[PDB]
Amino acid sequence: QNPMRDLKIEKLVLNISVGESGDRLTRASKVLEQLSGQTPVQSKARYTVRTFGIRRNEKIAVHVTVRGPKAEEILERGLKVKEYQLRDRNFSATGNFGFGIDEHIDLGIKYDPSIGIFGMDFYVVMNRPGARVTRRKRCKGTVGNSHKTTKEDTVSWFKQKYDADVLDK
Template identity: 75%
Template sequence: MSANKSNANKSNKSSKSNEKDKTPTVNAMRELSIEKLVLNICVGESGDRLTRAAKVLEQLTGQTPVYSKARYTVRSFGIRRNEKIAVHVTVRGPKAEEILERGLKVKEYELKRSNFSETGNFGFGIQEHIDLGIKYDPSIGIYGMDFYVVLGRPGARVSRRRKSQKKIGFNHRVTKDETIKWFKQRFDGIVLNR
């Protein structure tokens, strides 16, 4: 009787393994995800316009923006070295996905091929921040902004950690074509060949 049970168990196990072999497995380590979204407004001068641009980013993200300084003096632009000329904020997690969705809706989910970098990141700009659903405030005005999206795979920390830093292999790095494919699948986006 015990021999019959063991034979029955073996046949059940083999039928289960056949079922698993039929479905294509997806490697969870190969899936792309948004690591971060950086929103940038470059005003080109310090002062009142820059603080108003910071208010726009704070309204949009709910985070305190950081000021960026000029690297060197450019007389023709009227900027001096170390003068605050831009504001940016880094957003991660579900909030980043929600803001990116709103930004792509403004662009009608249409990007150029040149918007995508060779390292698997992409960026685009919008002309008016009020298109994102922020109410127009006459005291602030209208600002355009840049969106920069960094994509990554699980395991990328290996190249950034402090101890035992290693390089990521070429087959695990994010490429331009993989990012374009992810963008088309995730957002039903259109990539123009320009």
């Protein structure tokens, strides 16, 4: 039935794609670092694209992963930025959901003229207890079908907790 079927936030990953290396990358990394409380990780570019202007391996994006109640707090701040309204398209078939926001001023960092303005992509990964079965090195296994997270369960949880409503489209 429901002894330990309770959904929880596995992680919150915050992604910023400035698109080109340098001062803008460092400023976005500083914004991510002060928001998370952790140092962020920059991610290299896989392939050279002329239209974007990117070459291979210039650390073109910066992202951070936060777990636990701190991640829950930043998700609360993101949802009150989004006014607790999310599209049905935002949720995925696996049960994970994300949204994208513009500027950290709405998050309330306040503005420095040097640092500029950078928007963010918030993504929440949802799992039940017992997810260690896939992650552990010894006796790695696949999770059973009933215990899997799904879109209907995650939208029901998102309606019940955070007292939010989903948009029909």
